Design a protein around this ligand. Structure first.
Ligand code: S0N
Ligand code: S0N
Ligand code: AMP
Ligand code: AMP
Ligand code: CA
Ligand code: CA
Ligand code: MG
Ligand code: MG
Ligand code: MG
Ligand code: MG
Ligand code: MG
Ligand code: MG
Ligand code: MG
Ligand code: MG
Ligand code: MG
Ligand code: MG
Ligand code: MG
Ligand code: MG
Ligand code: NA
Ligand code: NA
Ligand code: NA
Ligand code: NA
Ligand code: NA
Ligand code: NA
Ligand code: NA
Ligand code: NA
Ligand code: NA
Ligand code: NA
Ligand code: NA
Ligand code: NA
Ligand code: NA
Lengths: 484, 483
């Protein structure tokens, strides 16, 4: 039911191995444990207690890694907050999560949250003297470690409860797939508040593996960093891979694995990677599976071009239509099972009842398996738009648009975008005139920037079925004029 | 609480990868699943059912690997029987384990067991037709998978219940320690009825890693096999490692890990290996921990010469004397904890209550930790003698000798042996005269060969304490040889 705290044990086993490279900082596992314990002590001095919930609002930096591990050492659930969210969106997640604290810095406006949580500046925190404490030396496998918000298919996002067990089994299953060696170093230049970034921190302490952390994604900085630090592994979404290939015709020699996730990739991009020797491992995974659950090796990437691969060891996938398992090549809903699959959504009784069926999690994605068991994900959802690896839920954007007094009806669907894959376009029935710039300013207060419509259209009515349900995939074809 | 059956999932993921190389013949993971399922179907025809217990009595053969997996596919607990045991010793284990079946072959005299269990000849079995069955597609993590007998400190061995989860976590913790890559291949020339050998079969399906299987250990054959099959990992006890160093000064280029376990190694052997480039990983582990739980990397093998190393990831160790915490360098009993530690001894209420203390397992070994947490095991037990990696329990050998009519008292202690490490010597007080030859003939029927006393001594009395309990460490003084 319990394991020794991974950072504590890692520091005991290999104290001088490098845990973290960030800018001009190198942090050993010993140093990482010491800094996380110290930050835990300082958090306890600000009244944080075992069983509490603390939200983290930070850009990628060493202090963010300290904060996550400090929470674990205190027995505190960590809520990772997307830094691009508006105040409005963050407030809901702070309240819904039951957070009592917000750990952030001066680059965010802490005063807007003071009425709901105690705000703590991590940089001021680390300057304070505090009494030493006895850390939580064990992680309970079934305890919720981290909460991440996703799947706002009805308008409001859901908090995914990711257990210590989930994170352990994710890391172990990935190691069994990719192999692990002492020379491996993993470069993370995508947000630590996504499980794409955060999972590398757990791989780091479980494997004893250096993570090279970047705050932002810059292709040239990433190429220099790979060279300087002999990076062997890197995670990416397809926009990042596309940017890498636009910069260089050759993959750095030390790279043995580019873990590609977070949405569909254009097939010409994957073919170019294979042609030019980029070792791309396409994968299928989500917040709810604590990162990858199906992954595709480069050796099959052209024979199975279009496939996400096979389930990781200990994990399972099946395709069902209305409760009937599908034959090979028959389309249906992707359902997943494994020790990396989340406990449940936080305080979403109805969603949990709907989403789980006899141990299996319904993903909401459509796909099929071929005759060898390889998964093919079909880009068919209209309740989800993926832009640069960021999920956008039409229901959330539509809810904001509908709240405007001039808007009578609202539909949002994804338009093709060469750089981002898909971007949201808005389709509106108006009571009164309103400009695109007016609505954009209105969305700016309520939506992260990547969620705001890139184009607006005005219609007399929206396409709906006999039950009055919006048919989002039919919005692009309706009679409309562009709204200026 | 459950995982897909490891062999079934591995065959789904990498069907054409080589699972097993035996007599230089190859079995893919697809072929291994097919053969294990076929054997499971044939066992079901013989009325083996989910929840039964089946004992396995086989030398290292491909069919033994099939039998273990077939048991899992049927939901049947597998009791691994030591093939060197006398019929007498095996009958105790068949009855104590609750086995309903014995899977063996014609190299053993199955007729001796048919009054306790239904005996099945694996070779005759594989020739039979059988209906298809629905296999157990899942392994329950806390269900007992295998039983192995050990720790006969009271005079009879105890069956260690090893769960599927125990074996999974052993394999995962070892991979995190050693690293894993697609090119790894592991050679097993150790008995599969010990966890030293058997654990490689679970590593094989969890990692997708070939096991090169030898029925016996001969240094020449092992060296040729390593080079023929590009073996990168090998398991050894110190007698095997010493034999290797006698036949070659150069470690084969492909070997990256020699996992050494099963008892103390002579320090000059460890020094010579590192001097000559043999990548020896000393380890401390036992049946009760489903193989290694502490291991020492070659980078520390000189600075920490004499150490067993540090605990594997997820595992813990502490040193306690009389229930009190021991500071670094203070001697005490080694206690271990982790997800690879056994469920319990089977039907040994008193031993389980004594051996487990607040989630920790008492090992019966003495040791200390240095100031960096490295474990030093102190060779001080007199209730256990290790001969070529085989555990021998003085209490068991003494019980056999005591049962002889001419023997009034018996004490057994370990004598130094250049080849085996320690061998048992017997110290006797006799009612009537009896020769060493007569006593050896009597022991042949009741003890595996390596347990039989290599020398016999006669005494008027044995060293005892106030409570009249034998003091085995004092036996060596003093006596005359019995011929
Ligand atoms: C793609 C990223 C890196 C782009 O950010 P960046 O700012 O560097 O882009 P630039 O080219 O420099 O231009 C900046 C302009 O572009 C706007 N912008 C930035 N991001 C977006 C966006 N997503 N959509 C639309 N616009 C965007 C900026 O506002 C700016 O605009 P201007 O002011 O100039 O007009 C960055 O977006 C990024 O990091 N994306 C990745 C997020 C992510 O990690 N998603 C994965 C989430 N899914 C999971 O975590 C589960 C699956 C998973 O675990 C995984 C995923 C990937 C890889 C591995 C795994 C795994 O299983 O381990
Ligand atoms: C040492 C071995 C290989 C010697 O056997 P072998 O038959 O090859 O010896 P020879 O010299 O060739 O034979 C001549 C005669 O020698 C007699 N004999 C054989 N063995 C012994 C013995 N142990 N003691 C005394 N005499 C012996 C025979 O009578 C033979 O006569 P013939 O009949 O041939 O004419 C062999 O004994 C061996 O394989 N030993 C190892 C057994 C073992 O696996 N022990 C480990 C048990 N412990 C564990 O499993 C837990 C720890 C663990 O898991 C581990 C252990 C080691 C490595 C790794 C791990 C791990 O953690 O994964
Ligand atoms: N290889 C892939 N192909 C297509 N879609 C993907 C792939 N990997 C992930 N996705 C999508 O990304 C989503 C992840 O959402 P989340 O992790 O909840 O932010 C999944 O539910 C899929 O819809
Ligand atoms: N590195 C080591 N040094 C000393 N003794 C060991 C070592 N590894 C294993 N052992 C012994 O082997 C025993 C395990 O035997 P078993 O119960 O048959 O697995 C332990 O209790 C120890 O006495
Ligand atoms: Ca599963
Ligand atoms: Ca094992
Ligand atoms: Mg995420
Ligand atoms: Mg950029
Ligand atoms: Mg309105
Ligand atoms: Mg109105
Ligand atoms: Mg073959
Ligand atoms: Mg089971
Ligand atoms: Mg013992
Ligand atoms: Mg031999
Ligand atoms: Mg355990
Ligand atoms: Mg158990
Ligand atoms: Mg009881
Ligand atoms: Mg007698
Ligand atoms: Na530092
Ligand atoms: Na606490
Ligand atoms: Na270079
Ligand atoms: Na078909
Ligand atoms: Na199809
Ligand atoms: Na669904
Ligand atoms: Na797209
Ligand atoms: Na119109
Ligand atoms: Na045989
Ligand atoms: Na199956
Ligand atoms: Na009992
Ligand atoms: Na007890
Ligand atoms: Na006695």
């Amino acid at each position: 039911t319990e394991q020794p705290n991974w950072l504590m044990q890692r520091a005991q086993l290999t104290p001088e191995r490098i845990a973290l490279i960030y800018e001009d900082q190198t942090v050993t596992f010993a140093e990482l444990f010491a800094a996380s314990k110290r930050m835990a002590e300082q958090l306890a001095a600000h009244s944080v207690r075992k069983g509490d919930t603390a939200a983290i609002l930070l850009q990628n930096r060493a202090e963010m890694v300290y904060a996550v591990h400090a929470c674990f050492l205190l027995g505190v659930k960590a809520v990772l907050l997307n830094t691009k969210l508006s105040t409005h969106e963050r407030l809901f997640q702070l309240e819904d999560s039951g957070s009592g604290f917000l750990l952030t810095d001066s680059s965010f406006e802490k005063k807007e949250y003071e009425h709901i949580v105690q705000t703590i500046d991590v940089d001021e925190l680390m300057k304070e003297a505090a009494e030493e404490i006895e850390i939580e030396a064990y992680m309970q496998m079934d305890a919720t470690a981290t909460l991440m918000y996703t799947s706002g298919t009805t308008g409001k996002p859901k908090g995914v409860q990711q257990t210590f067990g989930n994170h352990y089994f994710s890391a172990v299953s990935s190691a069994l797939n990719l192999g692990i060696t002492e020379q491996d170093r993993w470069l993370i230049a995508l947000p630590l508040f996504h499980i794409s970034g955060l999972s590398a921190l757990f791989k780091s302490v479980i494997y004893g593996m250096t993570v090279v952390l970047h705050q932002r994604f810059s292709v040239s900085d990433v190429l220099h960093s790979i060279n300087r630090h002999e990076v062997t592994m890197i995670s990416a979404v397809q926009t990042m891979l596309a940017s890498l290939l636009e910069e260089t015709n050759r993959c750095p020699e030390s790279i043995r694995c580019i873990l590609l996730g977070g949405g569909p990739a254009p097939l010409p991009l994957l073919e170019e990677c294979r042609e030019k020797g980029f070792p791309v491992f396409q994968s299928y995974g989500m917040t709810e599976t604590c990162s990858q659950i199906v992954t595709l090796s480069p050796e099959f990437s052209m024979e199975k071009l279009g496939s996400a691969g096979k389930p990781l060891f200990s994990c399972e996938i099946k395709i069902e239509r209305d409760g009937q398992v599908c034959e090979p090549y028959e389309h249906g809903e992707i359902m997943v099972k494994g020790p990396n699959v989340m406990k449940s959504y936080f305080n979403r009784e109805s969603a949990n009842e709907a989403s789980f069926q006899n141990g299996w999690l319904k993903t909401g994605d459509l796909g099929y398996l071929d005759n060898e068991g390889f998964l093919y994900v079909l880009d068919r959802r209209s309740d989800l738009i993926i832009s640069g690896g960021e999920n956008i839920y039409p229901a959330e954007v539509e809810s904001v648009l509908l709240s405007h007094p001039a808007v009578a009806e609202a539909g949002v669907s994804g338009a093709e975008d060469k750089k981002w894959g898909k971007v949201p376009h808005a389709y509106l029935v108006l009571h009164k005139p309103v400009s695109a710039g007016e609505l954009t300013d209105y969305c700016k207060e309520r939506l992260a920037k990547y969620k705001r419509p890139k184009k607006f259209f005005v219609l007399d009515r929206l396409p709906r079925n006999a039950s009055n349900k919006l048919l989002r995939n039919q919005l692009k074809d309706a009679r409309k004029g562009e709204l200026l």
